[PDB]
Design a protein around this ligand. Structure first.
Ligand SMILES: Nc1nc2c(ncn2[C@@H]2O[C@H](COP(=O)(O)OP(=O)(O)O)[C@@H](OP(=O)(O)OP(=O)(O)O)[C@H]2O)c(=O)[nH]1
Ligand SMILES: [Zn+2]
Ligand SMILES: [Zn+2]
Lengths: 50, 57, 90, 1160
């Protein structure tokens, strides 16, 4: 059911949608849309469970 | 349709005016300091008829 | 009326008017022509007016009428100046 | 031939839009520079935000430069610099303006709930009205071909439409575009054509928006304001002193945020002006216009859209609106820690020497200079600053009969502030009379009270005749006394009774006062024996006066000596023959009702003195052996645990339902708890043996603790049960109850476990208390805000109708009668009598005449009584219809303040209300007042007819009941869920139950009746106070319900526009003036409407009073649109303006001024 209500279909549209959800303003690109998601739960300088 | 039916059906009347609910059920770019006042102005005060003045606006 | 002040209200209904008239009389006493009726006995003008009201003298109509006579005394007795001024600008 | 052009007295204030020229009228110059103060000279710049020529001079009478200094030129401006040298307070009142280039939209009239600029123009707010003035999508301003009148076009559409036609439909974009849009709009012709169109062949599919807009347009056109003023072109400037930049300590100035705002808008406006003279690129200029819009919108009201920052502070900037959207300190005041003063009277309080010295400073000055001593005023200052003995004596003269009113922090009711006569006390703490220590709800834990000195003459008389403690004998809530003796004194008088057999007793008789000589001289005891004496009683009847009655009664030593305190009247002896417990207050009450004020006061002082004295003489203490534990304790506990052990053993082998054995074992321990409690009480109560004559007898334990419990004095059964008995079922954080109650008690040791269990009760107790304490006041605010406008006026009107008062009887299946709800009530009309005559028409039920309602037997338990609910009054309350319940024994004085006193009395016991088919508690009261529909509302039969099914589930549907009879049918909707109560074919009455569940007050008022719904509310709100045991008169509930049913709804055809729901005030006053005006057919019939406290308080005439509590930004705006005016009879709105209150000592002033405002 979650997939049924999911507009995104691939990785690009997903990262772009997330980028637009986090930083609503500037047009989502390739580097920004990826680096932002990476700097959320996959980077020590931006995420740490200690 | 979506916004109207969800807002009306859900808010009956949300008891404690559960704000942190329908604000996520809205499209466009979120986290704005503009749309905030347009919801706290409709829920109470001029009850019933205000919920009909909301959609029309 | 050191402690009610309740025995004065039945003489003039509604405690509020009682306060008004009593403050009116006390205002007459504290500044201007004093002359109390009930003996002072070292009491402030606040209570003296209440004592008078309780005594039966000095009410609303009483003060108003005496004010009318006061006006007829200041005006009619000193008209020789006003009349002389009336001929100032013809 | 008046027409004065000065600042005299005003009768009303008007609120409306301001034209650009209207703004110019306030302009004493034009701000043109962002500059504030000089960087070096610290001197106001030329045309900056702090100009001297425009606003006001820095110093008082000297100009900017210094050509003129003293008062020589106070009317003449300076030559070198046009600076009007008057005052420095002039700088605080001077306005000023900034004249922008391109037009700017007002943030309020733009985006404030309804689009005021949009709804008036009929156009979307944040959708269309945004994109056309932010320079994006051009709009049309009226076209006679192809294009309409208010459509939205893009640049491509613009040029295309321009190419097709053009030069005959020109329409700009942006601010000035909306300006020409509002300006071109004809309110009149549209007001006509809209009335024409929105009435032609249209049912309830359109009428909504139709009536709404037409009423709004009619209001705006009649308001006088021109739509051109909606968006401003000239922005006024706030006075410099209201936003100063004052140098703090060692440099470091302190400025307001408004200076930053005005500086920004000035900068952006100047650049905009400069761009409209140099090169003009469309993008640059349009952007600067949007930036000017940003600055202006940020200055007027930030809110709202991102919030402009700057100023280094990460916090937003306090705009103009933020300074007027959301504690009145006063001189001649003080505060200190309170202390008991037993030797004081009832109209006196202990006021510290040094404290009173600083308070009556100006009075001491005046009196000193008056008598002599001090040659001048400064001499008095230097004389009191150096406390020179004699000055103190002068102080004893100024505070002679000059009352000072005391106040506590938590002011719930009127008795929060009471006046006393100052008594000098060598100390730094304030002493208070222990009798009025209950009205304040104050203890001596370390609590501190504040004192205020009535300066005005009539203020002193107000404090003496109203706020005086001696005038507050009875509680405003309930007729019962409030200054009633408490713990210490009551124990004393309880010890002055308590008939003990023998022990230096014997029936040695004497005569009253003589017995006193017997007591001090020992020999005889004090609590014997009984013994006989001669009592000289006094009674009166019919012709009043006094009738002696000497006799020989068998009292005790205590009763005999205590009898001396009793005043002239009273039944005598029998009031002393009892004891000291609850009748201790009863005696005070009866003394008040049969004697009067003064004798009731002195009686209170005497009983207080006597109470304390004999209490000290007694020497009642609290040793460890005072709380004797029952011997059957361990026995009962074993028996209870035996039963529960058997139950657990049964649960082990199935048998009993293990799912709910928890409940039944709880009943076991609960029963055991009652067993231990009953055992301890039966033991600790009686006991003793004495030795009367031939020995062997029993009375009641003289066990200190029991003495304290059986005489008020803070000691209840539950507490004692925990002291010696046992703490019963303890609560668990889950909300459930533990199946292992505290077997031990405080007299015994307490294990770590059960204490770690009891800590939950203490924690939740204090926590819940902290909540309900604030929640009580939270309710009180709403109560006051909705009720603080009605005052008893127009003396006593006519009318006879009123709720039939009857004793609240739960005795239908539980037996519980209360028949004291009728007293001091004005009778409707001769409420019959099993025979003839008796009760008069408007005769108010006296306190002695309500006792006459017992001589007519138990047959007469129903009397019709005039109430505030009814009453054919207009904008007030009839004196008769109310009652009399005050600290005063007579009827309420004309022009009182029923509203506030009612609200206070209701929200006062809110502190002692436990929050939770029975909700119960404070939340229940709130729901009742708010008139909220239940979670499962029942249904009633609107018209009496024949019950029959209306198509078994044919919709939609869901069952349908159709009670049809006589004429016309009705189709109600039953949603299957929940059953029924009436079979088909059966007939029902007008308002019969067909759901057997919780009733909705709306349906009751709409169908059952106003008397019924009010009876429901009052009898349902009291039921939650019955359980809490808080006495409160029904009058106050009826008072709030009075204006709770303020507005109604008309349904027919009259001068009023049908659908409009208006208050019965204008309704009744207009229907009375239409039946005998032209024709009764020019008016319709109304229908009462139930609305909650908040919904009712929301609606009010004054826009200032509304601007007080509810959202200011809304009320102020909507009141600005339509030329409204406050004039000006409300309490609240007349308080913030700082004038006489239209009630109490005022009223007469307002009445004279009201009639005065009839000439024009
Ligand atoms: N009810 C009443 N009392 C008056 C009135 N006028 C004077 N008194 C009483 O005078 C008593 C003390 O007053 P003083 O200042 O010592 O003498 P004063 O009358 O010449 O001024 C008080 O007694 P007290 O009140 O009996 O003392 P207590 O009962 O408070 O202990 C006071 O109540 C009056 O008009 N009404
Ligand atoms: Zn100058
Ligand atoms: Zn009435």
């Amino acid at each position: 059911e979650t997939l049924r209500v999911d507009p995104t279909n691939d990785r690009l549209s997903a990262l772009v949608e997330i980028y637009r959800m986090m930083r609503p303003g500037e047009p989502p690109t390739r580097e920004a849309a990826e680096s932002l998601f990476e700097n959320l739960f996959f980077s020590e300088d931006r995420y740490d469970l200690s | 349709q979506s916004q109207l039916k969800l807002l009306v059906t859900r808010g009956k009347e949300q008891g404690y005016l559960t704000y942190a609910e329908v604000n996520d059920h809205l499209p466009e770019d979120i986290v704005d300091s503009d749309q905030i006042e347009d919801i706290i102005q409709m829920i109470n005060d001029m009850g019933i008829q205000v919920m009909e003045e909301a959609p029309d606006a | 009326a050191r402690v009610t002040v309740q025995d004065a209200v039945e003489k003039i209904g509604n405690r509020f008017d009682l306060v008004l008239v009593a403050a009116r009389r006390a205002r007459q006493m504290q500044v201007g022509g004093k002359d109390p009726l009930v003996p002072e006995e070292n009491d402030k003008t606040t209570v003296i007016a209440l004592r008078e009201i309780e005594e039966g003298l000095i009410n609303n109509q009483i003060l108003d009428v005496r004010e009318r006579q006061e006006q007829q005394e200041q005006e009619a007795a000193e008209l020789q100046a006003v009349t002389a001024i009336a001929e100032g600008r013809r | 031939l008046k027409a004065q052009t000065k600042t005299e007295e005003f009768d009303a204030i008007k609120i409306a839009l301001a034209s650009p020229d209207m703004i110019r009228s306030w302009s004493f110059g034009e701000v043109k520079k962002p500059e504030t103060i000089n960087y070096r000279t610290f001197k106001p710049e030329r045309d900056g935000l702090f100009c001297a020529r425009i606003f006001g001079p820095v110093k008082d009478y000297e100009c900017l430069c210094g050509k003129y200094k003293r008062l020589k030129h106070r009317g003449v401006i300076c030559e070198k610099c046009g600076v009007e040298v008057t005052q420095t307070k002039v700088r605080r009142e001077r306005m000023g303006h900034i004249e922008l280039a391109s037009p700017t939209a007002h943030i309020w009239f733009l985006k404030s709930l309804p689009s005021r600029i949009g709804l008036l123009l009929d156009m979307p707010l944040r959708d269309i009205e945004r994109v056309l003035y932010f320079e994006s999508y051009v709009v049309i301003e009226g076209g006679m071909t192809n294009l309409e009148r208010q459509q939205i076009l893009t640049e491509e559409q613009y040029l295309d439409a321009l190419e097709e036609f053009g030069d005959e439909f020109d329409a700009k974009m942006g601010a000035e575009a909306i300006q020409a849009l509002l300006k071109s709009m004809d309110l009149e012709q549209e007001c006509e054509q809209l009335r024409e169109e929105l009435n032609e062949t249209n049912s309830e599919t359109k009428r909504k928006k139709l009536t709404k807009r037409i009423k709004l347009l009619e209001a705006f056109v009649q308001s006088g304001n021109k739509p051109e003023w909606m968006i401003l072109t000239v922005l006024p400037v706030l006075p410099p002193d209201l936003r100063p930049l004052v140098p703090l300590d060692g440099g470091r100035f302190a400025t307001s945020d408004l200076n930053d705002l005005y500086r920004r808008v000035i900068n952006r406006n100047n650049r905009l002006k400069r761009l409209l003279d140099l090169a003009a690129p469309d993008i640059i200029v349009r952007n600067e216009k949007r930036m000017l819009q940003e600055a202006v919108d940020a200055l007027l009201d930030n809110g709202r859209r991102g919030r402009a920052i700057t100023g280094s502070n990460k916090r937003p900037l306090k705009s103009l609106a933020d300074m007027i959207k959301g504690g009145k300190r006063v001189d001649y005041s003080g505060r200190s820690v309170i202390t008991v003063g037993p030797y004081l009277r009832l109209h006196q309080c202990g006021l510290p020497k040094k404290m009173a010295l600083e308070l009556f400073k100006p009075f001491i000055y005046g009196k000193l200079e008056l008598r002599g001593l001090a040659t001048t005023i400064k001499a008095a200052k230097k004389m009191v600053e150096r406390e020179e003995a004699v000055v103190w004596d002068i102080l004893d003269e100024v505070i002679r009969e000059h009352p000072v009113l005391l106040n506590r922090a938590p002011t719930l009711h009127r008795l929060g502030i009471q006046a006393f006569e100052p008594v000098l006390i060598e100390g730094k703490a304030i002493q208070l009379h222990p009798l009025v220590c209950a009205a304040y709800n104050a203890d001596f834990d370390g609590d501190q009270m504040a004192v205020h000195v009535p300066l005005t003459l009539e203020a002193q008389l107000e404090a003496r005749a109203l706020m005086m403690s001696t005038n507050n004998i009875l509680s405003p809530a309930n007729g019962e006394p409030i200054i009633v003796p408490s713990q210490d004194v009551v124990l004393g008088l309880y010890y002055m009774t308590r008939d003990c057999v023998n022990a230096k007793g014997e029936g040695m008789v004497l005569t009253g006062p003589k017995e006193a000589e017997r007591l001090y001289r020992s020999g005889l005891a004090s609590l014997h024996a009984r013994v006989k004496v001669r009592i000289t009683e006094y009674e009166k009847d019919a012709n009043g006066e006094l009738v002696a009655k000497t006799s020989l009664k068998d009292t005790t030593v205590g009763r005999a000596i205590l009898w001396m305190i009793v005043p002239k009247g009273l039944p005598y002896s029998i009031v002393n023959q009892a004891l000291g417990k609850k009748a201790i207050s009863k005696m005070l009450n009866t003394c008040y009702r049969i004697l009067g004020l003064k004798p009731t006061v002195i009686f209170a002082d005497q009983i207080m003195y006597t109470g304390f004295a004999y209490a000290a003489r007694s020497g009642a203490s609290v040793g460890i052996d005072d709380m004797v534990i029952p011997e059957k304790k361990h026995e009962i506990i074993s028996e209870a645990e035996a039963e529960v052990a058997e139950i657990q053993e049964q649960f082990q082998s199935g048998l009993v339902t293990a799912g709910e054995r928890y409940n039944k074992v709880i009943d076991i321990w609960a029963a055991a708890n009652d067993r231990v409690s009953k055992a301890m009480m039966d033991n600790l109560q009686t006991e003793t043996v004495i030795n009367r004559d031939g020995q062997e007898e029993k009375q009641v334990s003289f066990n200190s603790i029991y003495m304290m419990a059986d005489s008020g004095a803070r000691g209840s059964a539950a507490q004692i049960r925990q002291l010696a008995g046992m703490r019963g079922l303890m609560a668990k954080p889950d909300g459930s109850i533990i199946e292992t109650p505290i077997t031990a008690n405080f007299r015994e040791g307490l294990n770590v476990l059960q204490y770690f269990i009891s800590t939950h009760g203490a924690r939740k107790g204090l926590a819940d208390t902290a909540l309900k304490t604030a929640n009580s006041g939270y309710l009180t605010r709403r109560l006051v805000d909705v009720a603080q406008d009605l005052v008893v006026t127009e003396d006593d009107c006519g009318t006879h109708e009123g709720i039939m008062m009857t004793p609240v009887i739960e005795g239908g299946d539980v037996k519980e009668p209360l028949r004291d709800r009728v007293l001091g009530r004005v009778t409707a009309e001769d409420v019959l009598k099993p025979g003839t005559a008796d009760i008069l028409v408007p005769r108010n039920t006296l306190l002695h005449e309500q006792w006459c309602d017992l001589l007519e037997e138990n047959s007469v338990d129903a009397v019709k009584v005039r109430s505030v609910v009814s009453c054919d009054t207009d904008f007030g309350v009839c004196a008769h219809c109310y009652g009399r319940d005050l600290a005063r024994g007579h009827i309420i004085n004309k022009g009182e303040a029923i509203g506030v006193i009612a609200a206070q009395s209701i929200g006062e016991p809110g502190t002692q209300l436990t929050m939770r088919d029975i909700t119960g508690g404070l939340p229940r009261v709130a729901d009742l007042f708010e008139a909220r529909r239940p979670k499962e509302p029942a249904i009633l039969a609107e018209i009496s007819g024949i019950v029959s099914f209306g198509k078994e589930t044919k919709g939609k549907r869901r069952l349908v009941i159709t009670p049809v009879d006589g004429s016309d049918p009705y189709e109600e909707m039953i949603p299957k869920w929940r059953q029924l109560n009436v079979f088909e074919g059966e007939r029902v009455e007008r308002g019969d139950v067909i759901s057997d569940g919780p009733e909705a007050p709306h349906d009751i008022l709409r169908l059952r009746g106003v008397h019924a719904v009010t009876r429901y509310i009052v009898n349902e709100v009291q039921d939650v106070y019955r359980l809490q045991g808080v006495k409160i008169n029904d009058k106050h509930i009826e008072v709030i319900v009075r204006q709770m049913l303020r507005k109604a709804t008309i349904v027919n055809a009259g001068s009023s526009d049908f659908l409009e729901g208006e208050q019965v005030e204008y309704s009744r006053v207009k229907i009375a003036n239409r039946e005998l005006e032209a024709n009764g057919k020019v008016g319709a019939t109304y229908s009462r409407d139930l609305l909650g406290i908040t919904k009712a308080s929301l609606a009010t005439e004054s826009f200032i009073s509304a601007a007080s509590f509810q959202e200011t930004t809304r009320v102020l705006t909507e009141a600005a649109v339509a030329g409204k005016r406050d004039e000006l009879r409300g309490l609240k709105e007349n308080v913030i303006v700082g004038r006489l209150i239209p009630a109490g000592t005022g009223y007469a002033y307002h009445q004279d001024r009201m009639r005065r405002r009839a000439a024009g």
